[PDB]
Amino acid sequence: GFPLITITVRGRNVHMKQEHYMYLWHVPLTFITSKSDMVHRFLLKTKTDVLILPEEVEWIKFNVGMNGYYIVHYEDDGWDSLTGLLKGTHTAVSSNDRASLINNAFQLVSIGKLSIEKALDLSLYLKHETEIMPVFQGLNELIPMYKLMEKRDMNEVETQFKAFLIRLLRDLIDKQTWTDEGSVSERMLRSQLLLLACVHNYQPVQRAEGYFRKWKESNGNLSLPVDVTLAVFAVGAQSTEGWDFLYSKYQFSLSSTEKSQIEFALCRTQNKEKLQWLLDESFKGDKIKTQEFPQILTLIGRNPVGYPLAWQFLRKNWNKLVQKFELGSSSIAHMVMGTTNQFSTRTRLEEVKGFFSSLKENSQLRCVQQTIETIEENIGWMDKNFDKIRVWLQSEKLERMIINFEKL
């Protein structure tokens, strides 16, 4: 794995410890502080050392002068400190530094060194965030949690959780215009942020219904801003009329990003016959490219109504999937992981091992070990974190209705 630096402050004394998560090197560390001007330097040569600050401080931020991945830990004292910072004055650190913190906190939950309540507490400056970088890294952390909840009997906490995400990003969703305007970062943020809102049935779905209905009523002759099409197709594909129509454009569409967008829309339908239809003609290979099947199987497997037909399909048709798509192929590795790597129970983990060792010669793929390891990890994580997250969600809802701080 990677370097893990632990930072402990005791007045003016900064303790620095290095270790390798999963013996020793000269670690080029930098840092700023609540009193600090510039970026200060320290070469940790040893397991641990201490440096002296000229005065006491309210928060400290470290970076390691290396390429690639590393986590910086601090601890209960230090994470609280940075949290209050991010919530008071979040641009006191850079766009990437805020993304580092977010990524680190949540990995440290998975590693067992910070609680899930403390990360979920940190993620609340997010209602004050603007920049794309922490917003996506934010999503990269949180969305996986509900993907695990969707495959389980956890509907009430699933909904309170997504309700919490959308509440995080509500002001930044409301700010977007339904145009193609701005820089590459602002176009990508608009696109993914409007699609997220529609995915989560943020009521003000309607806007996308309107644009969709207009677009359809014109037989596709009106132009839609390109930044907004994914949303529009996605909520437009929730009806059968809109699904059938959007599919008609697919056949006659000689545009490749257009066909991709439409592919996504149709795969997110809660109509299961259509999911079964998509998987069938995709696999037949004549109404849809067989090249597309690896994607379509996986998009459906993440579909909260679609996941049991993907996995089932993968299993009934395994011998023909290997003929078309070979065994060693990345295609088959993609389809395995995408249909099973989001399970988080004992029954589910044995279901996989069951199915894949029953293959014999045809069993020895390491994607089966990865998707076991990841399922083992999910099981551990859920077993540990679901009751915590559930109490945190219910609790955080309640302090907005009334906390002792909120006057009295």
Side-chain angles (χ1 to χ4, degrees), residues 147 150-151 267-268 275 279 293-313 335-343:
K147 302 271 56 179
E150 278 173 347
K151 309 209 168 53
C267 284
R268 300 287 294 172
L275 302 180
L279 288 164
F293 177 85
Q295 215 90 280
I296 293 157
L297 188 70
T298 286
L299 292 169
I300 290 165
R302 268 171 258 206
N303 199 321
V305 132
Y307 71 78
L309 298 70
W311 182 210
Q312 177 167 99
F313 195 92
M335 291 181 305
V336 164
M337 278 136 172
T339 62
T340 65
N341 86 6
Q342 313 194 311
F343 294 128

Side-chain angles (χ1 to χ4, degrees), residues 72-76 78-253 255-312:
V72 175
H73 182 224
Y74 317 112
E75 278 197 28
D76 269 33
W79 276 111
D80 284 355
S81 275
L82 295 162
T83 297
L85 168 61
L86 288 172
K87 297 175 168 186
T89 313
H90 65 74
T91 66
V93 310
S94 73
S95 191
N96 316 332
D97 283 338
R98 295 194 302 272
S100 280
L101 285 160
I102 293 157
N103 177 77
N104 285 197
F106 286 95
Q107 293 292 133
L108 291 156
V109 180
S110 304
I111 287 173
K113 310 186 81 94
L114 193 67
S115 69
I116 192 70
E117 299 98 356
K118 247 140 168 50
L120 298 162
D121 278 355
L122 177 139
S123 66
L124 288 163
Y125 82 90
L126 274 200
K127 60 152 190 283
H128 318 283
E129 193 53 75
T130 67
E131 305 306 292
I132 182 181
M133 194 82 183
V135 174
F136 281 20
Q137 187 58 93
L139 299 186
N140 187 285
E141 300 313 318
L142 294 162
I143 290 169
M145 302 185 187
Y146 71 58
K147 302 271 56 179
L148 268 39
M149 287 174 200
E150 278 173 347
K151 309 209 168 53
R152 297 279 296 277
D153 187 19
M154 304 177 162
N155 199 76
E156 211 193 345
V157 192
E158 160 168 331
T159 64
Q160 274 178 54
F161 188 79
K162 299 154 122 80
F164 153 87
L165 192 81
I166 295 300
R167 269 163 23 249
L168 287 175
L169 306 171
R170 197 201 156 176
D171 306 336
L172 193 49
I173 283 161
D174 290 353
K175 277 182 168 304
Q176 301 301 286
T177 66
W178 287 63
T179 65
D180 284 322
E181 292 139 14
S183 52
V184 164
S185 303
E186 290 194 299
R187 293 189 68 200
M188 189 167 301
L189 178 58
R190 183 188 289 121
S191 167
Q192 299 303 134
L193 221 51
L194 301 169
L195 174 61
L196 177 67
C198 296
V199 165
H200 288 302
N201 298 310
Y202 174 81
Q203 203 249 287
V205 182
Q206 295 322 321
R207 203 151 174 191
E209 283 296 348
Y211 269 101
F212 181 73
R213 181 202 314 127
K214 297 295 298 195
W215 181 72
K216 183 176 170 282
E217 282 166 352
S218 81
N219 186 68
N221 286 304
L222 297 184
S223 178
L224 281 162
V226 192
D227 268 15
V228 181
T229 323
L230 267 170
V232 165
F233 289 174
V235 318
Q238 304 308 111
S239 60
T240 307
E241 290 292 314
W243 194 105
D244 287 317
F245 175 82
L246 195 44
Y247 172 76
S248 70
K249 297 300 182 178
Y250 184 79
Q251 290 177 328
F252 288 75
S253 163
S255 167
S256 80
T257 59
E258 198 172 358
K259 275 175 151 188
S260 173
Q261 288 156 1
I262 292 165
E263 167 181 330
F264 183 80
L266 303 162
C267 284
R268 300 287 294 172
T269 200
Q270 306 301 89
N271 188 331
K272 287 186 190 100
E273 202 216 333
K274 301 285 192 182
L275 302 180
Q276 192 64 53
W277 192 89
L278 281 186
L279 288 164
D280 288 355
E281 305 306 316
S282 174
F283 180 94
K284 206 151 188 309
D286 45 18
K287 292 171 164 273
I288 295 160
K289 286 283 138 164
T290 272
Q291 277 202 354
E292 298 322 302
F293 177 85
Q295 215 90 280
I296 293 157
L297 188 70
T298 286
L299 292 169
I300 290 165
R302 268 171 258 206
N303 199 321
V305 132
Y307 71 78
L309 298 70
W311 182 210
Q312 177 167 99

